[PDB]
Amino acid sequence: CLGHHAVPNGTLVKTITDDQIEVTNATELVQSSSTGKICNNPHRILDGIDCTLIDALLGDPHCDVFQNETWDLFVERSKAFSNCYPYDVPDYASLRSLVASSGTLEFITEGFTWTGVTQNGGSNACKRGPGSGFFSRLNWLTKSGSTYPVLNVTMPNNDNFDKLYIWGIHHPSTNQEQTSLYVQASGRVTVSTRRSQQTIIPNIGSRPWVRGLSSRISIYWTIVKPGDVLVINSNGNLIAPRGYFKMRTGKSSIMRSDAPIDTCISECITPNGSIPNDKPFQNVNKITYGACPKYVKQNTLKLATGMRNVPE
Amino acid sequence: CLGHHAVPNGTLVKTITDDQIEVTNATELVQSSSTGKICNNPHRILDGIDCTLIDALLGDPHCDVFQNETWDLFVERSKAFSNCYPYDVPDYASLRSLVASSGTLEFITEGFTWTGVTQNGGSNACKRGPGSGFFSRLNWLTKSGSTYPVLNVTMPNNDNFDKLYIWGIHHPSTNQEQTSLYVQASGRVTVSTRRSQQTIIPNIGSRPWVRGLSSRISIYWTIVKPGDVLVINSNGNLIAPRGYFKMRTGKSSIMRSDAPIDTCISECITPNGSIPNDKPFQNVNKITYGACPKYVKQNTLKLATGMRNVPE
Amino acid sequence: CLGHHAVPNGTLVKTITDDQIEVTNATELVQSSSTGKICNNPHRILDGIDCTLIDALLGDPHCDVFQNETWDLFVERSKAFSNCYPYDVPDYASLRSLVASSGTLEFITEGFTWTGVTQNGGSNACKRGPGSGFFSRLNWLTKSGSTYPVLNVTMPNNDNFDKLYIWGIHHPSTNQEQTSLYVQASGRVTVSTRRSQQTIIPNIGSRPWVRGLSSRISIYWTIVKPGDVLVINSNGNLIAPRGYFKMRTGKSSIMRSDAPIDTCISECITPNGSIPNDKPFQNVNKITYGACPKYVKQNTLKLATGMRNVPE
Amino acid sequence: DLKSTQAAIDQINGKLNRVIEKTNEKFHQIEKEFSEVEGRIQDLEKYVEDTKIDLWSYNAELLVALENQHTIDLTDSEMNKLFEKTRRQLRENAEEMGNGCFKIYHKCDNACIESIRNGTYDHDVYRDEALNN
Amino acid sequence: DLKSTQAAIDQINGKLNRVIEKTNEKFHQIEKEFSEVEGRIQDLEKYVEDTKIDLWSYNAELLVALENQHTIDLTDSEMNKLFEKTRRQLRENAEEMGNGCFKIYHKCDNACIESIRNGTYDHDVYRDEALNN
Amino acid sequence: DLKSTQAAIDQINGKLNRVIEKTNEKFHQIEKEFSEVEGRIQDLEKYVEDTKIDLWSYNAELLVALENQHTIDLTDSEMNKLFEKTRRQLRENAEEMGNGCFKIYHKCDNACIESIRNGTYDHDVYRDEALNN
Ligand SMILES: *[C@@H]1O[C@H](CO)[C@@H](O)[C@H](O)[C@H]1NC(C)=O
Ligand SMILES: *[C@@H]1O[C@H](CO)[C@@H](O)[C@H](O)[C@H]1NC(C)=O
Ligand SMILES: *[C@@H]1O[C@H](CO)[C@@H](O)[C@H](O)[C@H]1NC(C)=O
């Protein structure tokens, strides 16, 4: 007859002259469903089962299997928790995005010389095995017998890459445990490069009981560029580092998702799972990784690939 | 002849190939004028003649006619003023938008027990009639003879809706009127629910003279959800509540406008008045209420409904 | 034959149905190159060779040739430096944009009466000639013999334009030079109009050595509107003004550029030079002066002015 | 006098408590202001993101609308073209009913339909029976 | 010594005044910075709103422009179509003047205009007088 | 007792040092927070500018695309129109090869090309040799 046989299934399409008209054939332009699983190909996915990035960085005793983990995309679960000395990080999101975008947990140990103090402090809230323990990348120094001299140490950077140092400060609970751990009635930590400096002083006070402790630890970091030098001065309440992490630049990020991991192939990853990328648009999430399609607010956008469904 | 007779009045229209051409007939797509009056149908308009929302909430003596007023849109005039004890509200805009969006001034009085103090304090700057007065929703407690004990009261919420409590604190002017009104040399107010707490301490000092007073009042509010409880502890400088307002959710808002009110019918309301909604665009105000047309920056946008005005 | 002879040079054009197709003729719509020189016509360009706007305002001894300079566009070079008393400006960008947009450096001297002090203080870091000197628009007052009374001066504004006053405060280095320059052990400067007030107190301390000095000067400004009055009260560490600049309103701005100046004609000026304005788009800089074309992120946008290059 | 010294101690302790509580309440105010400014920046970010999303979505909607309009226009134009072609070659054998479809008055084998589909048709062999039907 | 105690009182009072004025000026600086940051956020909000308004207005302008272009194109195309149809049926009786209008050389009653408007016309009954005029 | 007064001096000096260091560290925290908020506003400004630039550039891209589409459509439509006109006037002398070009079977002087270009042509004078070639 005229060319189209008035198919029983109509296809409503959005135009600019009219609003919604009927055409013979139409195609969908928005992928709006997910498989439910996170492909592990060809990207390198690391599953942070019960640990966050900072706990796997510090050396929590139950994610000591994550030493020198190399990821292309870190997946963070919501069931993660900490089981060591209670701590605190000023500018937590900045450090989390800095370590997420680095892509490595490679830790080179360095030889610091702490003379006049006792090294390798432990805690009964951070049991490593059957005995007391602590974080694996830090060194808790206390008084040696009856005194605590002013530690003053230096470390130059002669290589051609940046070094990331992680240190901390100890906030005690009472005024008896300050002088019983650091003979000085007040502590102070100064960390200096050739172009910057950070000085912190412990804040004695009481805190909520957490896992059996009312003291705290504050975590700080420093970046040393090639050709610089680092000097650390202190007279108490210092959680020293043991070395440096190697800093890289590339394509890496982090994503919170509770989806399992399978062995498929997909180029985009959202917290809902992997999505195909044959269509130009998607309506799943505005947080995306890889060569994904752009996030729109509309659900069904149909593109006509034929003629009208009715004459006249 | 050819179809169009070259009408004497030209109609310039904007295109994308050319810029502005002449066509036979054209229609306007932007309503750019207002009547000057605010319809009171089918919306429920409340005219806050010389009072704002907070003064009609607190119980100012010259808007005591606004008790249990139910509005669909509150209209605020610029000639409004206050004629009671000088006060102050931290986070004024938040509370104004919270009460504006609730849509009711329904006040349920509750029985508080204040033992050891004198109730129903008054002021000569808030005359209710020929004698001294105060706000009608608050209770000013002072010392009883020679002492002011620590008030500590409780009130549980067993219903299934939220309750809004409004309280305050009194900032005196000198150190003699503090101890002559509250025997304690320093006041303190603690208000606590099962999940939050607010503690305020009066700030003794001098202020600008306002209506004959140099003291101040600060106004705070609390929200109690179903199943909770409220506890109030104090030892001076407390402006207690008398009950709670019932909190609702719906379609309500507030608008500043100095336009009169008539008995017409229109679906959109702007601070300039009611505007018809037959056209898709409007160029009057970007603040709008109802099913209004969207605000554009252009004045004249003409849509062609015919043919060109000239051949070739 | 068919109409087009399949020119040897193809012209790729961007469409919306296809992506890039070949047509016979095409024109470029984006001017993406600059001449390298800054026209001085018909705009009035002022070349701030080794001085910024603030140094030419204060009266630096090596840009004393810039007195009563009238500009339409100020060009700031990167080789500029200061060679006078080290100073400091709170809200530097605000003042820089305020003086840049005024368009004049016209300075009317006024007769202030400072009784009890010594005027015309000098410095050996601001040599004006072979001897000591200072800024040319300010007056450094010190103690007269053995005392420094409380200066309190007034100046009314009876004209019909705004007046801009520039003053400062002196921050000494030690506690001996404070009392050897101002007998008071602490200074203070109050500047008041009928509607505003600014009070500053000098901050004694040591600073980095700059050109042989460790003292500083902080620079402030005041705006007096017609009908107002200015009152200055002080008891030390005051860098007084000598008059006022006349404030205008018009078309003037400032631009950082290191391009030479020629005698051509162009209507737009960018830090790269003058650009023609025959095309609607440009891809040089988003900072522009005059009737320039808009900045896009695309480099080559071609507009078709003919037919396709191939049949079918 | 030791009493004067003790009074001095009392008043300096009073000033000490004063500055202590003053600094405390000022710091509380400052942290409150910090939090409210942080929240303001947060909602501003949210508004910016919402605006960007709306604008890009509307751009996509307009783009697909333009594409649909172009496609529909081209296809129905060429359909009308071929229909006019048929109407030209179908002069006095069948007649269009009004929906772009020709009701045929006579009967012809599939060879006639083939001749119609290839544009080589003579409506004279059956014009007689077409006028008769 | 009571003199040493009095000197200690003097110096602690000096330090007290020092920290008082220092805290005061620091708080003044802090509130000034708070105000300027508030103003910065305010003008940023204004800029965001202005940008959104401009973009939406330009979107509306482009939309109505596209609609106008489509309407004009369709109407003038169909006008040229019907004009060509008339020119076909008006072969050798009248002649177009150049503006899409036919100057008629002969006179005919309104029946001829009706026959033109219904597309059933024979330009032979008046072709003789048309060539004669 | 002078010892009690000295102990009071010691403890008030301790409190003095305490409030001094506390105010110092609080001010340090405050200036750090000021700097980070300034940086946040800075990157927000950058994001706003980037968004505006992208949107305006895409608007320009879409505008020029629409213009190109309109131009191409009009020119190729009128080209097909004139080609059909030629094909009408070129009935049985030459034949189109498939790319909108007519292969001519006979030879004619430039007068024939002129007659083609002015639309006044008789394909009968050479139809015989055209069928013969
Ligand atoms: C309609 O379009 C789809 C595109 O996926 C195609 O597979 C299908 O064959 C089309 N239908 C017809 C009748 O051509
Ligand atoms: C022009 O359009 C308006 C639409 O309001 C209509 O009322 C009017 O009749 C039209 N004019 C003509 C000549 O059709
Ligand atoms: C192509 O367009 C340019 C526009 O600058 C024009 O100068 C040129 O003559 C055109 N080419 C032809 C073959 O028309």
Side-chain angles (χ1 to χ4, degrees):
Chain A
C1 183
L2 77 163
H4 70 267
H5 67 274
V7 294
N9 166 263
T11 59
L12 295 174
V13 286
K14 167 89 203 264
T15 61
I16 202 63
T17 301
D18 288 333
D19 187 26
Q20 293 176 358
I21 73 173
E22 286 275 76
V23 288
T24 47
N25 204 16
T27 202
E28 188 68 35
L29 282 198
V30 179
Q31 160 84 10
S32 76
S33 61
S34 190
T35 86
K37 293 179 179 179
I38 297 186
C39 314
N40 60 345
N41 269 125
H43 295 300
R44 293 182 183 174
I45 310 294
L46 194 66
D47 193 7
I49 313 118
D50 287 323
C51 297
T52 49
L53 197 43
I54 176 58
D55 283 332
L57 179 81
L58 293 173
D60 215 12
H62 84 290
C63 282
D64 265 1
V65 306
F66 296 98
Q67 311 209 325
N68 292 27
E69 295 302 320
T70 54
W71 67 87
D72 289 345
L73 179 81
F74 201 92
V75 173
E76 248 175 1
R77 314 300 194 171
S78 37
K79 63 183 185 190
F81 57 94
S82 160
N83 199 256
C84 187
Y85 211 100
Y87 66 96
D88 184 45
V89 188
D91 219 8
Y92 174 90
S94 74
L95 181 58
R96 182 193 180 257
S97 58
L98 263 293
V99 172
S101 48
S102 43
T104 59
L105 284 173
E106 181 190 2
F107 181 83
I108 320 290
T109 312
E110 276 182 336
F112 287 94
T113 168
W114 321 95
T115 80
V117 291
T118 73
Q119 303 190 28
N120 303 137
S123 49
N124 278 285
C126 196
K127 293 179 179 179
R128 185 187 260 90
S132 174
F134 201 68
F135 298 98
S136 73
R137 305 282 186 222
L138 295 174
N139 203 345
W140 191 5
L141 321 160
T142 48
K143 71 171 173 56
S144 57
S146 173
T147 59
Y148 189 106
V150 59
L151 308 160
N152 181 56
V153 292
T154 296
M155 188 56 67
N157 180 13
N158 301 309
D159 289 345
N160 299 142
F161 45 79
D162 301 288
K163 293 179 173 181
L164 173 75
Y165 288 84
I166 310 278
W167 44 281
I169 185 162
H170 177 226
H171 307 293
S173 178
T174 39
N175 223 319
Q176 187 270 6
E177 96 188 32
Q178 163 93 46
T179 54
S180 295
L181 292 173
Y182 303 96
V183 307
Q184 275 80 230
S186 157
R188 172 197 55 88
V189 285
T190 71
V191 297
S192 51
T193 52
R194 294 183 181 277
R195 52 173 183 86
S196 305
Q197 206 280 344
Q198 180 59 285
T199 304
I200 325 288
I201 294 182
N203 306 266
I204 289 96
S206 268
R207 280 97 181 178
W209 263 126
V210 52
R211 286 180 281 282
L213 294 174
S214 178
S215 183
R216 292 295 187 270
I217 291 183
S218 210
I219 299 294
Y220 303 87
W221 75 89
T222 306
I223 299 199
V224 175
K225 296 170 74 176
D228 289 345
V229 174
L230 62 94
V231 181
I232 294 169
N233 202 272
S234 151
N235 64 353
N237 302 95
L238 174 145
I239 303 301
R242 293 182 183 174
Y244 60 92
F245 296 86
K246 290 193 58 179
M247 294 300 293
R248 286 183 158 85
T249 181
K251 300 320 171 180
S252 57
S253 52
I254 191 168
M255 172 174 293
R256 304 187 183 94
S257 316
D258 264 294
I261 294 186
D262 184 1
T263 77
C264 55
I265 293 178
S266 173
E267 269 87 335
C268 176
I269 295 297
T270 70
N272 309 109
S274 57
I275 293 152
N277 51 335
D278 291 83
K279 305 174 187 179
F281 304 114
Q282 69 87 11
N283 192 31
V284 180
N285 192 31
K286 61 181 188 294
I287 309 163
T288 59
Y289 181 82
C292 308
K294 51 158 50 65
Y295 187 76
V296 293
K297 183 178 179 180
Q298 302 199 11
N299 198 38
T300 181
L301 284 155
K302 282 176 166 182
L303 177 63
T305 75
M307 71 288 292
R308 264 198 177 96
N309 202 18
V310 302
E312 289 168 307
Chain B
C1 183
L2 77 163
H4 70 267
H5 67 274
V7 294
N9 166 263
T11 59
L12 295 174
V13 286
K14 167 89 203 264
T15 61
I16 202 63
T17 301
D18 288 333
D19 187 26
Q20 293 176 358
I21 73 173
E22 286 275 76
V23 288
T24 47
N25 204 16
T27 202
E28 188 68 35
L29 282 198
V30 179
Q31 160 84 10
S32 76
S33 61
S34 190
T35 86
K37 293 179 179 179
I38 297 186
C39 314
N40 60 345
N41 269 125
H43 295 300
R44 293 182 183 174
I45 310 294
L46 194 66
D47 193 7
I49 313 118
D50 287 323
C51 297
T52 49
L53 197 43
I54 176 58
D55 283 332
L57 179 82
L58 293 173
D60 215 12
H62 84 290
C63 282
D64 265 1
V65 306
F66 296 98
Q67 311 209 325
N68 292 27
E69 295 302 320
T70 54
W71 67 87
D72 289 345
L73 179 81
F74 201 92
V75 173
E76 248 175 1
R77 314 300 194 171
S78 37
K79 63 183 185 190
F81 57 94
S82 160
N83 199 256
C84 187
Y85 211 100
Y87 66 96
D88 184 45
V89 188
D91 219 8
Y92 174 90
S94 74
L95 181 58
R96 182 193 180 257
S97 58
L98 263 293
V99 172
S101 48
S102 43
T104 59
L105 284 173
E106 181 190 2
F107 181 83
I108 320 290
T109 312
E110 276 182 336
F112 287 94
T113 168
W114 321 95
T115 80
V117 291
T118 73
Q119 303 190 28
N120 303 137
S123 49
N124 278 285
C126 196
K127 293 179 179 179
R128 185 187 260 90
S132 174
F134 201 68
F135 298 99
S136 73
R137 305 282 186 222
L138 295 174
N139 203 345
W140 191 5
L141 322 160
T142 48
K143 71 171 173 56
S144 57
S146 173
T147 59
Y148 189 106
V150 59
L151 308 160
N152 181 56
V153 292
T154 296
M155 188 56 67
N157 180 13
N158 301 309
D159 289 345
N160 299 142
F161 45 79
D162 301 288
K163 293 179 173 181
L164 173 75
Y165 288 84
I166 310 278
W167 44 281
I169 185 162
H170 178 226
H171 307 293
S173 178
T174 39
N175 222 319
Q176 187 270 6
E177 96 188 32
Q178 163 93 46
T179 54
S180 295
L181 292 173
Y182 303 96
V183 307
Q184 275 80 230
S186 157
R188 172 197 55 88
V189 285
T190 71
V191 297
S192 51
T193 52
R194 294 183 181 277
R195 52 173 183 86
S196 305
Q197 206 280 344
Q198 180 59 285
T199 304
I200 325 288
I201 294 182
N203 306 266
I204 289 96
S206 268
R207 280 97 181 178
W209 263 126
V210 52
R211 286 180 281 282
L213 294 174
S214 178
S215 183
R216 292 295 187 270
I217 291 183
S218 210
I219 299 294
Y220 303 87
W221 75 89
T222 306
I223 299 199
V224 175
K225 296 170 74 176
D228 289 345
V229 174
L230 62 94
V231 181
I232 294 169
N233 202 272
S234 151
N235 64 353
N237 302 95
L238 174 145
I239 303 301
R242 293 182 183 174
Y244 60 92
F245 296 86
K246 290 193 58 179
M247 294 300 293
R248 286 183 158 85
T249 181
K251 300 320 171 180
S252 57
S253 52
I254 191 168
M255 172 174 293
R256 304 187 183 94
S257 316
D258 264 294
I261 294 186
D262 184 1
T263 77
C264 55
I265 293 178
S266 173
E267 269 87 335
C268 176
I269 295 297
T270 70
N272 309 109
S274 57
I275 293 152
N277 51 335
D278 291 83
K279 305 174 187 179
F281 304 114
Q282 69 87 11
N283 192 31
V284 180
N285 192 31
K286 61 181 188 294
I287 309 163
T288 59
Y289 181 82
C292 308
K294 51 158 49 65
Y295 187 76
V296 293
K297 183 178 179 180
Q298 302 199 11
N299 198 38
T300 181
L301 284 155
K302 282 177 166 182
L303 177 63
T305 75
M307 71 288 292
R308 264 198 177 96
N309 202 18
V310 302
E312 289 168 307
Chain C
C1 183
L2 77 163
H4 70 267
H5 67 274
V7 294
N9 166 263
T11 59
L12 295 174
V13 286
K14 167 89 203 264
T15 61
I16 202 63
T17 301
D18 288 333
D19 187 26
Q20 293 176 358
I21 73 173
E22 286 275 76
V23 288
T24 47
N25 204 16
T27 202
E28 188 68 35
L29 282 198
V30 179
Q31 160 84 10
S32 76
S33 61
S34 190
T35 86
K37 293 179 179 179
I38 297 186
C39 314
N40 60 345
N41 269 125
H43 295 300
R44 293 182 183 174
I45 310 294
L46 194 66
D47 193 7
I49 313 118
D50 287 323
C51 297
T52 49
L53 197 43
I54 176 58
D55 283 332
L57 179 82
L58 293 173
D60 215 12
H62 84 290
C63 282
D64 265 1
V65 306
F66 296 98
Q67 311 209 325
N68 292 27
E69 295 302 320
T70 54
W71 67 87
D72 289 345
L73 179 81
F74 201 92
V75 173
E76 248 175 1
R77 314 300 194 171
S78 37
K79 63 183 185 190
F81 57 94
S82 160
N83 199 256
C84 187
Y85 211 100
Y87 66 96
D88 184 45
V89 188
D91 219 8
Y92 174 90
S94 74
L95 181 58
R96 182 193 180 257
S97 58
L98 263 293
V99 172
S101 48
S102 43
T104 59
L105 284 173
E106 181 190 2
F107 181 83
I108 320 290
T109 312
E110 276 182 336
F112 287 94
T113 168
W114 321 95
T115 80
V117 291
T118 73
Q119 303 190 28
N120 303 137
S123 49
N124 278 285
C126 196
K127 293 179 179 179
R128 185 187 260 90
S132 174
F134 201 68
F135 298 98
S136 73
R137 305 282 186 222
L138 295 174
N139 203 345
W140 191 5
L141 321 160
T142 48
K143 71 171 173 55
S144 57
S146 173
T147 59
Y148 189 106
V150 59
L151 308 160
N152 181 56
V153 292
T154 296
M155 188 56 67
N157 180 13
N158 301 309
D159 289 345
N160 299 142
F161 45 79
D162 301 288
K163 293 179 173 181
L164 173 75
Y165 288 84
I166 310 278
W167 44 281
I169 185 162
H170 178 226
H171 307 293
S173 178
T174 39
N175 222 319
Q176 187 270 6
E177 96 188 32
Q178 163 93 46
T179 54
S180 295
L181 292 173
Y182 303 96
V183 307
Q184 275 80 230
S186 157
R188 172 197 55 88
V189 285
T190 71
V191 297
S192 51
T193 52
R194 294 183 181 277
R195 52 173 183 86
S196 305
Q197 206 280 344
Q198 180 59 285
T199 304
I200 325 288
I201 294 182
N203 306 266
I204 289 96
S206 268
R207 280 97 181 178
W209 263 126
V210 52
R211 286 180 281 282
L213 294 174
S214 178
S215 183
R216 292 295 187 270
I217 291 183
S218 210
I219 299 294
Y220 303 87
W221 75 89
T222 306
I223 299 199
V224 175
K225 296 170 74 176
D228 289 345
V229 174
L230 62 94
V231 181
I232 294 169
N233 202 272
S234 151
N235 64 353
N237 302 95
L238 174 145
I239 303 301
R242 293 182 183 174
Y244 60 92
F245 296 86
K246 290 193 58 179
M247 294 300 293
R248 286 183 158 85
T249 181
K251 300 320 171 180
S252 57
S253 52
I254 191 168
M255 172 174 293
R256 304 187 183 94
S257 316
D258 264 294
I261 294 185
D262 184 1
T263 77
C264 55
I265 293 178
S266 173
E267 269 87 335
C268 176
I269 295 297
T270 70
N272 309 109
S274 57
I275 293 152
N277 51 335
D278 291 83
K279 305 174 187 179
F281 304 114
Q282 69 87 11
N283 192 31
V284 180
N285 192 31
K286 61 181 188 294
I287 309 163
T288 59
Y289 181 82
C292 308
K294 51 158 50 65
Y295 187 76
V296 293
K297 183 178 179 180
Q298 302 199 11
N299 198 38
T300 181
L301 284 155
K302 282 177 166 182
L303 177 63
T305 75
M307 71 288 292
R308 264 198 177 96
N309 202 18
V310 302
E312 289 168 307
Chain D
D1 187 18
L2 73 161
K3 278 83 180 180
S4 45
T5 65
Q6 293 177 335
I9 294 169
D10 300 332
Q11 58 96 10
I12 64 189
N13 181 28
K15 298 297 179 181
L16 185 148
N17 310 310
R18 285 283 96 174
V19 294
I20 280 187
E21 53 88 12
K22 279 184 291 184
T23 44
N24 294 331
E25 51 89 11
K26 293 304 205 156
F27 295 154
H28 298 320
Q29 291 284 343
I30 287 154
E31 293 177 350
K32 293 309 179 288
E33 301 317 86
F34 266 128
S35 45
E36 61 91 351
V37 168
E38 180 74 29
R40 289 199 62 162
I41 303 166
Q42 285 286 336
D43 59 62
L44 181 50
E45 290 161 330
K46 290 293 302 304
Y47 186 49
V48 171
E49 296 140 10
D50 192 331
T51 309
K52 181 176 178 182
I53 292 309
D54 299 341
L55 291 169
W56 276 118
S57 44
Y58 176 50
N59 272 121
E61 179 290 317
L62 172 58
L63 160 62
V64 302
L66 292 154
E67 293 177 350
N68 289 337
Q69 209 81 54
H70 188 206
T71 51
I72 295 170
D73 292 342
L74 61 94
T75 180
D76 71 4
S77 46
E78 60 93 351
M79 178 77 74
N80 299 138
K81 178 42 193 159
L82 58 92
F83 170 75
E84 167 59 42
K85 292 180 58 181
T86 59
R87 161 176 37 199
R88 267 176 178 173
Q89 293 177 335
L90 186 173
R91 171 179 167 183
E92 208 172 351
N93 62 347
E95 293 177 350
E96 64 178 46
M97 66 177 185
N99 307 119
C101 205
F102 297 110
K103 156 201 177 184
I104 315 172
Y105 299 88
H106 59 79
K107 178 255 173 189
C108 53
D109 296 331
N110 187 234
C112 77
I113 314 294
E114 285 174 319
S115 147
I116 298 311
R117 281 165 291 181
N118 56 55
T120 79
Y121 180 62
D122 178 23
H123 69 110
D124 200 9
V125 193
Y126 319 96
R127 201 172 310 126
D128 48 355
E129 52 179 15
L131 295 180
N132 192 88
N133 298 334
Chain E
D1 187 18
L2 73 161
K3 278 83 180 180
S4 45
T5 65
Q6 293 177 335
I9 294 169
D10 300 332
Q11 58 96 10
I12 64 189
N13 181 29
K15 298 297 179 181
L16 185 148
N17 310 310
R18 285 283 96 174
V19 294
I20 280 187
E21 53 88 11
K22 279 184 291 184
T23 44
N24 294 331
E25 51 89 11
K26 293 304 205 156
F27 295 154
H28 298 320
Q29 291 284 343
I30 287 154
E31 293 177 350
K32 293 309 179 288
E33 301 317 86
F34 266 128
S35 45
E36 61 91 351
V37 168
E38 180 74 29
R40 289 199 62 162
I41 303 166
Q42 285 286 336
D43 59 62
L44 181 50
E45 290 161 330
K46 290 293 302 304
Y47 186 49
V48 171
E49 296 140 10
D50 192 331
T51 309
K52 181 176 178 182
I53 292 309
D54 299 341
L55 291 169
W56 276 118
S57 44
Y58 176 50
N59 272 121
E61 179 290 317
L62 172 58
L63 160 62
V64 302
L66 292 154
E67 293 177 350
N68 289 337
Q69 209 81 54
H70 188 206
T71 51
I72 295 170
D73 292 342
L74 61 94
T75 180
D76 71 4
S77 46
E78 60 93 351
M79 178 77 74
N80 299 138
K81 178 42 193 160
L82 58 92
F83 170 75
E84 167 59 42
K85 292 180 58 181
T86 59
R87 161 176 37 199
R88 267 176 178 173
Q89 293 177 335
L90 186 173
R91 171 179 167 183
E92 208 172 351
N93 62 347
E95 293 177 350
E96 64 178 46
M97 66 177 185
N99 307 119
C101 205
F102 297 110
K103 156 201 177 184
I104 315 172
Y105 298 88
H106 59 79
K107 178 255 173 189
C108 53
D109 296 332
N110 187 234
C112 77
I113 314 294
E114 285 174 319
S115 147
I116 298 311
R117 281 165 291 181
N118 56 55
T120 79
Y121 180 62
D122 178 23
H123 69 110
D124 200 9
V125 193
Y126 319 96
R127 201 172 310 126
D128 48 355
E129 52 179 15
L131 295 180
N132 192 88
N133 298 334
Chain F
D1 187 17
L2 73 161
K3 278 83 180 180
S4 45
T5 65
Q6 293 177 335
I9 294 169
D10 300 332
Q11 58 96 10
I12 64 189
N13 181 29
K15 298 297 179 181
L16 185 148
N17 310 310
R18 285 283 96 173
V19 294
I20 280 187
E21 53 88 12
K22 279 184 291 184
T23 44
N24 294 331
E25 51 89 11
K26 293 304 205 156
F27 295 154
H28 298 320
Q29 291 284 343
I30 287 154
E31 293 177 350
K32 293 309 179 288
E33 301 317 86
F34 266 128
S35 45
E36 61 91 351
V37 168
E38 180 74 29
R40 289 199 62 162
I41 303 166
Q42 285 286 336
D43 59 62
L44 181 50
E45 290 161 330
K46 290 293 302 304
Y47 186 49
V48 171
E49 296 140 10
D50 192 331
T51 309
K52 181 176 178 182
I53 292 309
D54 299 341
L55 291 168
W56 276 118
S57 44
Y58 176 50
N59 272 121
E61 179 290 317
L62 172 58
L63 160 62
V64 303
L66 292 154
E67 293 177 350
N68 289 337
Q69 209 81 54
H70 188 206
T71 51
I72 295 170
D73 292 342
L74 61 94
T75 180
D76 71 4
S77 46
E78 60 93 351
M79 178 77 74
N80 299 138
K81 178 42 193 160
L82 58 92
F83 170 76
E84 167 59 42
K85 292 180 58 181
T86 59
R87 161 176 37 199
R88 267 176 178 173
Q89 293 177 335
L90 186 173
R91 171 179 167 183
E92 208 172 351
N93 62 347
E95 293 177 350
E96 64 178 46
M97 66 177 185
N99 307 119
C101 205
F102 297 110
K103 156 201 177 184
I104 315 172
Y105 299 88
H106 59 79
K107 178 255 173 189
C108 53
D109 296 332
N110 187 234
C112 76
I113 314 294
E114 285 174 319
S115 147
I116 298 311
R117 281 165 291 181
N118 56 55
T120 79
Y121 180 62
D122 178 23
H123 69 110
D124 200 9
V125 193
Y126 319 96
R127 201 172 310 126
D128 48 355
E129 52 179 15
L131 295 180
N132 192 88
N133 298 334

